[PDB]
């Protein structure tokens, strides 16, 4: 019996949900930052 | 395969298959009555305590059993059909259920000659006149040429009345069932 890549999130135990959340929070933060930058660029490029 | 002629009543099991083979064989060549008589004969012939003891021992080789049965059949001057049937039952080792085969063929021949077994059950016995009218009416139930085979048991468990079986037909004019019916319907 072996182990394969992407198995922690295949089991779906506690580590799977923990990893999913650790990813989602970080990328929500980065999406917020990128959206702020996109708004700034929009405003600065109207003229 | 040879289109065997089916028997009137289908008997099932090992005895059923052997008896149906015998009935199909006899029905062609028209030897049903003689073969039935020979079957009744072998019913007693094999029943002899010496022969029965010598045929229920599975350590006498099938060869010896077949030879003894051939000698008996020759000594009894049977039809080739019955001799071959006994030989076949001996080769296949089916002697322990030979009486089952004879009983099956008896049941199968009785229906061939048009008989419908009947049963009558009453709390007490009957007077012969009443039994005569019973014969008449039950013959009324039957079809044309269908002889009747009455049996009059006496069951005191029922409280009276009468119970009649004609083949699969059944009529229950017994006190007990009507008591049960009233008690149940009234209980509801």
């Amino acid at each position: 019996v072996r182990s394969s890549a992407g198995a922690v999130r295949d089991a779906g135990g506690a580590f799977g949900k923990r990893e999913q959340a650790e990813e989602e929070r970080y990328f929500r933060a980065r999406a917020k930052e990128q959206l702020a930058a996109l708004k700034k660029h929009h405003e600065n490029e109207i003229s | 395969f040879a289109k065997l002629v089916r028997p009137p009543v289908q008997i099932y099991g090992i005895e059923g298959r052997y008896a149906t083979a015998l009935y199909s064989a006899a029905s062609k060549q028209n030897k049903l009555e003689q073969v039935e008589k020979e079957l009744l004969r072998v019913g007693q012939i094999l029943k002899e305590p010496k022969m029965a003891a010598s045929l229920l021992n599975p350590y006498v080789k099938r060869s010896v059993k077949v030879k003894s049965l051939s000698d008996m059949t020759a000594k009894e001057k049977f039809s080739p059909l019955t001799s071959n049937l006994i030989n076949l039952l001996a080769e296949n080792g089916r002697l322990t259920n030979t009486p089952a085969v004879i009983s099956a063929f008896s049941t199968m021949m009785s229906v061939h000659r048009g008989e419908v077994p009947c049963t009558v059950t009453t709390a007490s016995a009957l007077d012969e006149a009443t039994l005569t009218e019973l014969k008449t009416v039950l013959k009324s139930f039957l079809s044309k040429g269908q002889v009747l085979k009455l049996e009059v048991k006496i069951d005191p468990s029922i409280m009276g009345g009468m119970i009649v079986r004609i083949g699969e037909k059944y009529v229950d004019m017994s006190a007990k069932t009507k008591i049960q019916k009233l008690s149940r319907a009234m209980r509801e």
Binding site: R2 | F1, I14, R17, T20, K28, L81, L85, L88
Partner: protein, 508 residues
């Protein structure tokens, strides 16, 4: 108790003495027919596994000889067979045609052409159920069977007379390994060296007809049919044909083995022959075992695979390599048939889906792959480079976990990771693009001497290509020297050094 021949029809026949006009020695009457199994009454002089012929033009193999009846397995649909039919002996166990008249022809499990190219020559016939050779005729495996795949020829060498095993999951590249092996033999068959020519047999058990048609087109495109036989036992074929097709192929290959030539037979797929045999056994009411497989299912594959031998010069010297293919379900090499055939064969090429999508195609997973023959089935030059390549890859596989971190680790681990990544990018290969042994050894020699420690891993697949085209065009004398000689002589080593440095000196 009861017998199946005690039906009232047989007893009726026997009571009135009608059993003497019927010849129950060479003919029989079907008692039952269903799900491709017929139960026949008579045929008292019929041998086990003999072929009988039904009245309606069908054939069948008599497998179960019981006291009452014979259990025949029908070679086709049981639509045409009815209870009461007449079955006649053929007299001979099943055999198939053999010879060079089959090469380039697609045949079915019984040697009948199905490609519509006309009758089949068929000068000689051979029984499919023939015992394999013994201890004495064989001799150790020494010659190599050039697969044309860098991984298989470098780290999982296959000799001649060896039984490898392409075990893997679904859609990993097993048939691709087989087809590349078949196609790479054109460089030998075209040439004149008569002891390097390999004739190929492709047994296609249980594949749909479109797959086999596309495969035959692929071989024809590569001009690799003139020395290939294809034996089709596709899904629509009756279970007995799928069960026999490996044996028909093995006998068509045993012909070549017995006559001094060399053959390669690729039983693809054996896990479907096992299923067909399981069907036949369950419908013959034989006692099931693990996973419903009959008891003698190890026997079925062992007596097939033990016919892949390397006869000695006192018998001809020919050989019959076998490359059985098995499809494991999840990764389960501990299942029943995978276990049996892993314990029967001499090695295994273990393919992956993690590696297939990580970009490592062919997905040969080294470390799980093995060849108990090993270096004995390699050329001297390939030995020289592959010893170092295998050692370095083994070192790389035990520190591959750190590959993600990599940095913040000692210099030795950094070097191991770098060399391993370069080597893995080297073992990558295209599809249907086998490589001569000189090409492989040149490429691996460049790789394993550090001459790629400067190139970025993404550029190794382009280096390999450009460098290989270079050497193949400019430098043919060195490649010819390595090929014919078989080893890397010191002067040839120096020439390879200068060539690799000069090409790498400017690559950009």
């Amino acid at each position: 108790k009861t017998g199946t021949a005690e039906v009232s029809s047989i007893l009726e026949e026997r009571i009135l003495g009608a059993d003497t006009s019927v010849d129950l020695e060479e003919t029989g009457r079907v008692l039952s027919i269903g799900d491709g199994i017929a139960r026949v009454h008579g045929l008292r002089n019929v041998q086990a596994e003999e072929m009988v012929e039904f009245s309606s033009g069908l054939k069948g193999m008599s497998l179960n000889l019981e006291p009452d009846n014979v259990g025949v397995v029908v070679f086709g649909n049981d639509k045409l067979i009815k209870e009461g039919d007449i079955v006649k002996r053929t007299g001979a166990i099943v055999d198939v045609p053999v010879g060079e008249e089959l090469l380039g022809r697609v045949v079915d499990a019984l040697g009948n052409a199905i490609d519509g190219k006309g009758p089949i020559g068929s000068k000689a016939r051979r029984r499919v159920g023939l015992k394999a050779p013994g201890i004495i005729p064989r001799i150790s495996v020494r010659e190599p069977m050039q697969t044309g795949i860098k991984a298989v020829d470098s780290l999982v060498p296959i000799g001649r007379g060896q039984r490898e095993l392409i075990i893997g999951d679904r859609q990993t590249g097993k048939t691709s390994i087989a087809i590349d092996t078949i196609i790479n033999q054109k460089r030998f068959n075209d040439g004149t060296d008569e002891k390097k020519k390999l004739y190929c047999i492709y047994v296609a058990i249980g594949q749909k007809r479109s797959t086999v048609a596309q495969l035959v087109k692929r071989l024809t495109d590569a001009d690799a049919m003139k020395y290939t036989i294809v034996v089709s036992a596709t899904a629509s074929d009756a279970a007995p044909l799928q069960y026999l097709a490996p044996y028909s192929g093995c006998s068509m290959g045993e012909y070549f083995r017995d006559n001094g030539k060399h053959a390669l037979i690729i039983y693809d797929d054996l896990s479907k022959q096992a299923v067909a045999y399981r069907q036949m056994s369950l419908l013959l009411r034989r006692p099931p075992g693990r996973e419903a497989y009959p008891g003698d299912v190890f026997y079925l594959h062992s007596r097939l695979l033990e016919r892949a031998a390397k006869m000695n010069d006192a018998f001809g010297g020919g050989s019959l390599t076998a490359l059985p293919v098995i499809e494991t379900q999840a990764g389960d090499v501990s299942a029943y048939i995978p276990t049996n055939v892993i314990s029967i064969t001499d090695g295994q090429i273990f393919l992956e889906t993690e590696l297939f999508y990580k970009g490592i195609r062919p997905a040969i997973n080294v470390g799980l792959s093995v060849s108990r023959v090993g270096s004995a089935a390699q050329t001297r030059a390939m030995k020289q480079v592959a010893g170092t390549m295998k050692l370095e890859l083994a070192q790389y596989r035990e520190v591959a976990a750190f590959a993600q971190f990599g940095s913040d680790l000692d210099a030795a681990t950094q070097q191991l990771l770098s060399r391993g990544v370069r080597l893995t990018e080297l073992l990558k290969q295209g599809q249907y693009s086998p490589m001569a042994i000189e090409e492989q050894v040149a490429v691996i020699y460049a790789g394993v001497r550090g001459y790629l420690d400067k190139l970025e891993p993404s550029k190794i697949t382009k280096f390999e290509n450009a460098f290989l085209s270079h050497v193949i065009s400019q430098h043919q004398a060195l490649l010819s020297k390595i090929r014919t000689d078989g080893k890397i002589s010191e002067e040839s080593d120096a020439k390879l050094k200068e060539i690799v440095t000069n090409f790498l000196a400017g690559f950009e």
